Amino acid sequence: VSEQSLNGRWTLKFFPQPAVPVMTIEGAEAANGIVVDAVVPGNVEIDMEAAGLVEDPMVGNNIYKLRPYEGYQWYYSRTFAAPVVTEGQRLVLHFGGIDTFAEVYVNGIKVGSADNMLIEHDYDITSVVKEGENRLDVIIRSSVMEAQNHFLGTLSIGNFSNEESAPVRRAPSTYGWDIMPRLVSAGLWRDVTLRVENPVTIVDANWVTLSVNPKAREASESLYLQTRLPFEMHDKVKAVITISRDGRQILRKEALMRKFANLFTLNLSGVDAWWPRGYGEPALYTAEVSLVDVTSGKIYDTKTSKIGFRTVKLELDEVNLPGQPGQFQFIINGEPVFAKGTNWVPLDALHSRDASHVEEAVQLMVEMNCNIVRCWG
Amino acid sequence: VSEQSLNGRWTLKFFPQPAVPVMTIEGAEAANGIVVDAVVPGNVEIDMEAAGLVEDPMVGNNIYKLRPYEGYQWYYSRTFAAPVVTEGQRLVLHFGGIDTFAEVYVNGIKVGSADNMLIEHDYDITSVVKEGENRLDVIIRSSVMEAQNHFLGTLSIGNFSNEESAPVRRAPSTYGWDIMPRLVSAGLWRDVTLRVENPVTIVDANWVTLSVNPKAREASESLYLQTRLPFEMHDKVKAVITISRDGRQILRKEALMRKFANLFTLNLSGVDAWWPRGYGEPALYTAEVSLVDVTSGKIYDTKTSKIGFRTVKLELDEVNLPGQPGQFQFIINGEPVFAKGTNWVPLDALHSRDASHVEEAVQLMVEMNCNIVRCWGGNVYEDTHFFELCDKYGIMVWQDFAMGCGNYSQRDNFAAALEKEAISVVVKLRNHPSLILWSGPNNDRVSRQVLSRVIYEFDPTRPYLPSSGYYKDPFYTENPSQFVSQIGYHGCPNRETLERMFSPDSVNPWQNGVVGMWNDEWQTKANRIYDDKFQGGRNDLMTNQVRIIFGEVPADLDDFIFASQSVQAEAMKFFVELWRGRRPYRTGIIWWNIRDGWPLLSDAISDYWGGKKQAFYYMQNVHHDVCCLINPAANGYMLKVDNNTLKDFEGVVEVKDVASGKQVFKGKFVSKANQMSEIATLPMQKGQGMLVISYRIEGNEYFNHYLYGEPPYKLDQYRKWVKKCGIYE
């Protein structure tokens, strides 16, 4: 129905982590720490430099001066107006990125516990949200100290990746590499939003290119659609599939929703294939699917994404060193492409600034004419 | 000690499921619904038709009128007197079948949560039962809505099995198939009882045939006995094993119970082996084990079951397509048996009526002389009595695990729910001699790990197989599989069935008299899972087959029924004769199918109401233990005789043309045991016609026929050939 954003100014209170880490709001407020203004999405080091508490780590040996903060806790807090929810609607609190181990409270009620900085986190706060001003509190603990909650196997010690990185789900380069500095950091480094979902909603729209014929401008595309559908809405809701490019509608298919999960296959004509750089055009088509009430015409949900009709196959060599690394070739749309490109390292040691560099960084590959890029583990 | 039954009249309250499903008694009573009388075991649709709330779903398009109830909840409730329990005794509440997701309360205390309609459910209500009147409440929620509690993998969407069937443990055919209608249903479809167990009780009595020597009438049988035994009862209780047959005691062994779990081996003499139909007698022996007090003589528990001394081995081919499907042969008691039988589909879309059809349905296989039956994975697991009849009548059982067409989840939740189901079904059925095989891209955790590990630990005696329009077309006649699952041919049911399941105006198939078009009712009885109005599809399989064999489609209804049934009769007979005549390479044939589970237009040879189609009688004559048949040859036809027994037979076979009466062949034959024998190469006949195969063995006249020539045939002429032949009617 809507997506209210919770980005902006938050309250950040940081303090050294005690022997028993702080998990509750009472302990976080009782702890003796410093309170400064914070920006979400952001990194805690950015908020402290804005407060004049840390020097610029990009200059000289200032990076080492952030060392004590690896054992600090970080208490994000803000208020928010609750969006309007009607009966059957669900209120979801969405985190694009929590770095890392945090307890999330809404109006003093714990709604989740995060432990992976690389994936999104969604919590159903429908039953805990209140009318009017609400409170949202996130209490992050030390990622480095979290490693001492595990016993490492022999093979996990002594590698180039830090031992602290082995038992936790974080970016290994944040602990230090030969190309990226050590800067564990913390904070809400991606968007925080409030989402309202109708009882009839799209759970997943999976687009799959079954086959492609670039010469005949044909393609067979599959849509694996999973939805949330109350049984009173079975046979009363229809799926509206729409393929278009540059405003011109290529296909509009309608089908009655009789199940919650369906597979739709579309045999398309006059459609171009997606090619990497040099081997043709990167033809993209707008693929939209909406759940519409058959009687009232109400649109309950709409999922839109730009897809490309393309097939990928990895032809492995069977003579010259069969099974050894590098003995393969990518087969795109049946053609053996020659890959030329770069390795993708972190865009910023403070990863909340990543999104601000993607445009410039991708444009480097466009000028370089890379047809491939490997996002480094 | 005792087993009090809780079957009978219950109170059923149904209501649409809210956004938050009802899980408690307070919410169930607070919900606004309808209360009617219910029968247990039963289906909720049966109770509502008894209340006059739903029309007969077996007639016309009434099946679609049950659609809203797939999103309903069902509140079973009844009172019961508590049986007398003494100290140490346990009171167990037994459910034979809960369909499906239900919360079970006894005196307002939740005693269990069910989530598998195919296995039993037992709850210890000893600490919650009260003296006097007790209350038992079962709150079932929507099975269809339960699917939306899961995220399906890519390979679970788009298969023939419904997406709603993928994440739940139910019979996949209940959501709709091409042979069974969509009817999710709900309720307590099997027995509900109260069981009292002594502190000394038998947990499991596993009977295993180690070896058998049919000639010397010897067998080595193992008893894996697990018991519940208080340590104060160790060395004070004895196990009394008893093997008997027809009242005569064969062996009585006694042993002091010094442990809770023991293995007993019995070397028996003067005991006959269990054989499938044709290969000998289905010899069954009553095997009883009792735990008796050494001093007081008190019998604490007794487990009795009829077992059969039999060994099963699956010899897999290693030359002709090694590893491909169908390249195997069953080795029963050391002998390579040739399997002939049918696929087992649901006995009823409302599965509480299954038990009422087992006797009649199994008797169809006995008349058909099937020595094997494959229980299809789209169906529920049949109860104990079905296997008892298969044990008694010598019909081997191929058991699929309840898995439908498509790939399933590879995660821990589905594996754990399936492991619990497989362990439960294996322990329950592993003692039946009729059961001979378990059956489940080569990286599927379900078939290559979960199910295989269960068989490895709980049934190491049976093989496990991870298997997940002219009838003379080379598509059929050039099948490379030694063990074939024949697809089956469509056949219009007997006229009486049409007038019973169709509206009077819809008995005739042609809508507005147009030959080529079916009305909306015949399209429904072609299994149209959802009421989407179209024309064509599966129903065209009927008229297409009649057109290939007889040229045109008869406008007259009775002319169409006989024609469509004759096509199915000749086609299915040809398949059985073609595989029996291609031994020893061909090792078995299982065809689709002997009986329908709903009044429908299907490829089965007998309908839900017992109407045997023309194909049933044709198949009967080519299912004999010793059958004289004719196969097509390179330059004519080959008269042959197939032996599915262990004994040799002599006889005389005569081959004659129907119309002309000219004797084509007559001579003596020697049918060597457990093999097919060529008798003579018959010269090719002119044009169309039909031959008569008359053979006598041991003073018994058996009959068969062969339709020669190429289609299309003249329906009136073919009817004249069958009439003059005097084999069928």
Over chain A, what HEC string results?
Answer: CEEEECCEEEEEEEEECCCCCCCCHHHHHHCCCEEEEEEECCCHHHHHHHCCCCCCCCCHHHHHHHHHHHHEEEEEEEEEECCCCCCCCEEEEEECCEECEEEEEECCEEEEEEEECCCCEEEECCCCCCCCEEEEEEEECCHHHHHHHCCCCHHHCCCCCCHHHCCCECCHHHHCCCCCCCCCCCEECCCEEEEEECCCEEEEEEEEEEEEECCCCEEEEEEEEEEECCHHHCCCEEEEEEEEECCEEEEEEEEECCCCEEEEEEEEECCCCECCCCCCCECCEEEEEEEEECCCCCEEEEEEEEECCCCEEEEECCCCCCCCCCCEEEEECCEECCCCEEEECCCCCCHHHCCCCHHHHHHHHHHHCCCEEEECC
Resolution (Å units): 2.6
Residues of B in contact with A258 (CB under 8 A): 530
The pairing of beta strand B636-643 with beta strand B676-682: antiparallel
Q: Which two tokens stand for residue B50?
A: 């008894």
Tell me how far apart the alpha carbons of residues A12 and A34 are, in angstroms, rounded to a whole number.
8
Tell me how far apart the alpha carbons of residues A132 and A143 are, in angstroms, rounded to a whole number.
34
Indicate the residue of B16, B148, B158 with minimum beta-carbon distance to A260: B148
Residue partners of A143: CB distance under 8 A and separation at least 6? A70, A99, A100, A101, A164, A168, A170, A184, A186
Distances (CA, A) of B113 to A15, B94, B137, B184, B293: 47, 13, 12, 19, 37
- φ, ψ dihedrals at B529, nearest 5°: -55, -45
Burial of A289 (0-12, 13-18, 19+ CB in 10 A): buried
With an 8 Å Cβ cutoff, are B147 and A228 in contact? no
With an 8 Å Cβ cutoff, are B158 and A263 in contact? yes
Q: Using the structure block, give the residue that is written with the tokens 């807090």.
A: A77
| Strands of the sheet with B2-5, listed across from one edge | B2-5, B192-197, B90-95, B121-124
Q: With contact defined as beta carbons under 8 Å apart, do B186 and B143 qualify? A: yes
Q: With contact defined as beta carbons under 8 Å apart, do B196 and B90 qualify? A: yes
Q: Using the structure block, give the residue that is written with the tokens 């006989």.
A: B562
Q: Which two tokens stand for residue B544?
A: 């297409």
Residues of B in contact with A124 (CB under 8 A): none
Indicate the residue of B154, B162, B532 with minimum beta-carbon distance to A259: B162
- The total number of residues written for chain A in this structure: 377
Which of A230, A206, A260 has the alpha carbon at shortest distance from B165? A260
Tell me how far apart the alpha carbons of residues B387 and B91 are, in angstroms, rounded to a whole number.
28
Indicate the residue of B19, B151, B163 with minimum beta-carbon distance to A259: B163
State whether residue B152 sits within 8 Å of chain A by CB.
yes
The experimental technique used to determine this model is X-ray
- Dihedral, CA atoms, B245, B247, B251, B253, nearest 10 degrees? 120
State whether residue A255 sits within 8 Å of chain B by CB.
no
Tell me how far apart the alpha carbons of residues B82 and B93 are, in angstroms, rounded to a whole number.
11
State whether residue A203 sits within 8 Å of chain B by CB.
yes
Q: Which two tokens stand for residue A84?
A: 């309007």
With an 8 Å Cβ cutoff, are B164 and A260 in contact? yes
Query: Residue B73: closest CA among chain A residues belongs to which residue?
Result: A231
Element (H, E) at B97: none
With an 8 Å Cβ cutoff, are A232 and B162 in contact? no
State whether residue B154 sits within 8 Å of chain A by CB.
yes
Tell me how far apart the alpha carbons of residues B202 and B187 are, in angstroms, rounded to a whole number.
30
With an 8 Å Cβ cutoff, are B19 and A230 in contact? yes
Query: Chain B closest CA to A255's CA: distance in Å?
Result: 11
Distances (CA, A) of B274 to B41, B84, B265, B346, B395: 34, 42, 19, 27, 10
Query: Chain B closest CA to A256's CA: distance in Å?
Result: 10
State whether residue B530 sits within 8 Å of chain A by CB.
yes
A·B CB contacts under 8 A? 52
State whether residue A259 sits within 8 Å of chain B by CB.
yes
Test mutation, B14, B142, B152, chain A, max A CBs within 10 A: B152
In the three-class reduction of DSSP (H, G, I as helix; E, B as strand; rest coil), residue B448 is classed as helix
Residues of A in contact with B19 (CB under 8 A): 87-88, 199, 230
Which of B348, B387, B381 has the alpha carbon at shortest distance from B365? B387
Which of B476, B492, B483 has the alpha carbon at shortest distance from B578? B476
Residues of A in contact with B67 (CB under 8 A): 234-235
